[PDB]
Chain A
Amino acid sequence: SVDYQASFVGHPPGSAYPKLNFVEDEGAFAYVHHLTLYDLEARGFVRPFCMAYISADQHKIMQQFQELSAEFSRASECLKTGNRKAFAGELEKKLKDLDYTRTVLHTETEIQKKANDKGFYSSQAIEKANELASVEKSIIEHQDLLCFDKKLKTLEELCDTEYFTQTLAQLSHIEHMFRGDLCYLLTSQIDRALLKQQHITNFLFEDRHKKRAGQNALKFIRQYPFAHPAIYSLLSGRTLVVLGEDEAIVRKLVTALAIFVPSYGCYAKPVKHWASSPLHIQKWKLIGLQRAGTLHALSRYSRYTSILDLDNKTLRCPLYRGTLVPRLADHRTQIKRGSTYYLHVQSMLTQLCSKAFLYTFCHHLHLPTHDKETEELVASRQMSFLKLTLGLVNEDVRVVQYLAELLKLHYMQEYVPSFLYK
């Protein structure tokens, strides 16, 4: 029933010194990393007391076995270093305690009595100093390479865990790592398993309010008119600013649409998210300005801009007939969790990356090319889009833009109208 089984049948009968074994179930579906904590002041001078963690399905362990049994390796070993460290030190402490016996033993024996004792107890009083001094060297070597107190012995063994916090840190961190189900987890390995080989697609594009940072955008697109070219304007760029009356909203609704921005590369993000109004500058491709001084750079930079007015709707660059953004965003969409809408967005961008990936390469489209030199090749590059399934001449800009992002980094390591409607 309700959880009690941390040691119920989570303890194999010793069965080896460091061993790591398994249990079946009925509802247990368990796993055990049997670790004994041998205690001098304890019967057999040993203490099997093995902490691990137990989950369900028999599977989210079995094929996930390594790192769980590679971190239970690190965690359970870590505490073993600690209680021994308390135990190793205190053993000589009670050695000195019994060393004081000899200090009295010598005085008592044969002082005036002339050894009126046997005294064969003195054999005990000296033999103990040997094997305890022996297991000491066993402890330090074992450290580097390879009745109420009896249960209360477990206390300091469990108490010194609290001190030597690393054992509390890992099992806390372990409880963080694995979760209720492996699958959403399992992809995360696979997702990052793939990412190792391909990194060019990583910098060219985006890759913890992310529940809200997604959900707000879904509440954005699904019920905000004219928002469609906004994404386009944002995706293509090459700049955008958004001003509003109360700044209590722009913070909320510029983290929503921050997903779409192509970060320059190995940086944090290009969304300044707002500033004052000097507006000198290819360094910041999203700004708030929360605001006739602005109305000048409004028109002085009639190129590379856009606006908003929550008071009465507007923008600057609504020209788009293609189908790509409709796939990136359709107002007749049923995506619910929003966080999932992030995934649908996140996935699609890889395709946009993928098409963009192709255009950079193919080693038949750059200046070395078959037909001729002047502009035929620029016509020739157009026929690449026949292989590259463009949407419309507007989409030609996007994929051409991502070259510039990709072209720049390989290089480093080496005109538009404007509408508006209510």
Chain B
Amino acid sequence: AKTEIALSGKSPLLAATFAYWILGPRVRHIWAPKTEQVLLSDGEITFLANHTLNGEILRNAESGAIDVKFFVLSEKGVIIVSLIFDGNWNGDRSTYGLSIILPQTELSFYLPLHRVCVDRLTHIIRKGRIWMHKERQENVQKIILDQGQSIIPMLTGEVIPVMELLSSMKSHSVPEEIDIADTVLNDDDIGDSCHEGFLLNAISSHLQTCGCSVVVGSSAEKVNKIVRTLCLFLTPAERKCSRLCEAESSFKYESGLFVQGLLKDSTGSFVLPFRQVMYAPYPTTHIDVDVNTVKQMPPCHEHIYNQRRYMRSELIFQDVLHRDTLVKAFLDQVFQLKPGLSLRSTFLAQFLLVLHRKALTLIKYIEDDTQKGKKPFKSLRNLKIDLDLTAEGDLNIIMALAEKIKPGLHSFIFGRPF
């Protein structure tokens, strides 16, 4: 009725639950945190798992798809995020549900991640919903009488990283609040064809796609002095969902967050993993510090979705071709502001402030033209010139801050033409 998995780190989260559905059981099997000093008693956990049970029972007409739950219990301080399954008959509520258990006062930590966590787990049920017909093996009716042994394996391994993933961000202590520009920009000026020409190539690429990718290098410090820099260009809620990569911490590519890291590229050729990169919320870069190059995947929503459609059911592409004058502007003089002082940060925000505001107009602009059948926007030729958007480097950028606000915006414009 347990399985102990040690966690590499200091302060991991709490256990997870896998209660079954004949009579609704309090809990079937509970994963375990690291060999901590003190935990929360399983008897308490068993009730907490059983608590969602009758709460889960309250649902009617079970579902068509897997749906969410989320509990915060001030009494017996805990944060719970459970799921409801789709039954085997799809109408008979053969739900079993699962939820990692979270200590009090760590919903600030959790909630930005909440998209990550649901994503990670909802894949497990997608694997889980078959429904484990390998457990429908060639076996005698005594065996066909099964749950508590053959279900846990594919459940075990595929849920092991989740605690490590959640405990990863404590280890890779991605800057929560602020940074004094231990980033690049604090230097006077890099001043050279390659690196300075590189530095613009990445940041532009860092923007025309919403979410950056690995700083896949071999310094572990000069590797980490780019990931903290290219993240000045993202929201305070995105000070998280990023990782400051650590020297040989055996940490893979995890699809959810959209700034990442590794080191040494596995000492050889290593897969992206090509499967896991699609399961990221955005296309992303392929920044280096070894080669000082950049890459990128296709446009964020007119072709990843189509690529998503190809591969979602199965179960370094291009360089920066565009040079926004606006960012070529920005980066050119940012170093000219006599760095060392507080000046660049202010300038950065004022640069940033423009983009959101200039994004917000485009939000309002297109949503102003009443959407209708046979009535797409079709006025992009007017839109480009009208809003001071003629540099193709500049257009998609603000078109790329759209999806971060209107996720369906980018299809609303390019789906019909492309």
Binding site for B on A (CB under 8 A): 9, 12-13, 15-22, 24-25, 58, 62-63, 65-66, 183-184, 186-187, 190-191, 193-195, 197-198, 200-201, 327, 333-337, 339-340, 343-344, 346-348, 350-351, 353-354, 357-358, 361-364, 387-389
Is the Cβ of B337 less than 8 Å from the Cβ of A358? yes
Bound Cα distance A347, B236 (Å): 21
The answer to whether A21 touches B350, judged by C-beta atoms less than 8 angstroms apart, is no
Contacts of A361 in B (CB 8 A): 337-338, 343
- Are B352 and A194 in contact, with the CB atoms below 8 A? yes
Q: State whether the Cβ of B135 lies closer than 8 Å to any Cβ in chain A.
A: no
Output the nearest chain B residue to A11 by Cβ-Cβ distance: B58
| B27 interface residue (CB < 8 Å to A) | no
Partner of A350, one of B58, B353, B359, B369: B353
Residues of A within 8 A of B58 (CB): 9
Q: Known: A24-B69, A336-B369, A361-B338. Contact between A183 and B349, CB under 8 A?
A: no
Kindly provide the distance from the CB of B306 to the nearest chain A CB, expressed in whole angstroms: 24
Q: Are B111 and A350 in contact (CB under 8 A)?
A: no
The answer for the CA separation of A186 and B407 in the assembled complex, in Å, is 13
**Contact sample, A vs B, 10 pairs, CB 8 Å cutoff:** A16-B74, A19-B72, A62-B114, A63-B114, A66-B108, A194-B352, A336-B369, A343-B357, A358-B337, A363-B338
Contact A354 B67 (CB under 8 A): no
> Once the chains bind, are A348 and B388 in contact (CB under 8 Å)?
yes
A201 touches B55 (CB 8 A): no
Q: Say whether chain B's binding surface is mostly helix, strand, loop, or mixed.
A: helix
Quick one: CB contact mask for B364-389 with A, threshold 8 Å, 1 for yes? 11001100000000010010001110
Say whether B368 contacts A340, CB under 8 Å: yes
Q: Determine whether the beta carbon of B353 is less than 8 Å from that of A337.
A: no
**In the complex with contacts A334-B382, A364-B338, A15-B55 CB distance below 8 A:** yes
Instruction: Please measure, in the bound complex, the distance between the C-alpha atom of A346 and the C-alpha atom of B353, giving whole angstroms.
Output: 11
Partner among B333, B349, B388, B405 whose Cβ is within 8 Å of the Cβ of A327: B388
Q: Does B109 contact A (CB under 8 A)?
A: no
How far apart sit A20 and B332, CA to CA, in the bound complex (Å)?
50
- Distance (Å) between the CB of B335 and the closest chain A CB? 10
Q: Are A334 and B379 in contact (CB under 8 A)?
A: yes
B51 at interface, CB cutoff 8 A: yes
List the B residue with the shortest CB-CB distance to A31.
Answer: B70
B73 at interface by CB-CB < 8 Å:
yes
Contacting residues, chain B, for A13 (C-beta < 8 A): 54-55
User: What's the nearest-Cβ distance from chain A to residue B72, in Å?
Assistant: 5
Expressed in whole angstroms, the Cα–Cα distance for A66 and B405 within the complex equals: 19
B68 at interface (Cβ–Cβ under 8 A)? yes
Query: A201-B353, A347-B357 known; 20 other A-B pairs, CB under 8 Å?
Result: A13-B54, A16-B74, A16-B76, A18-B75, A19-B75, A21-B70, A24-B69, A25-B67, A63-B237, A65-B107, A187-B356, A334-B386, A335-B365, A343-B357, A343-B360, A343-B361, A348-B388, A361-B337, A362-B333, A388-B333
Contacts of A17 in B (CB 8 A): 74-75
Contact of A22 among B71, B329, B346 (CB under 8 A): B71
B222 CB-CB contact with A under 8 Å = no
Question: Is there an interface contact between A343 and B74, defined as CB atoms closer than 8 Å?
Answer: no
- Asked if A194 and B67 make an inter-chain contact with CB atoms under 8 angstroms apart, the answer reads no
Of the candidates B236, B357, B368, B386, the one whose C-beta lies within 8 Å of that of A346 is B357
Residue pair B350, A353 in contact (C-beta under 8 Å): yes
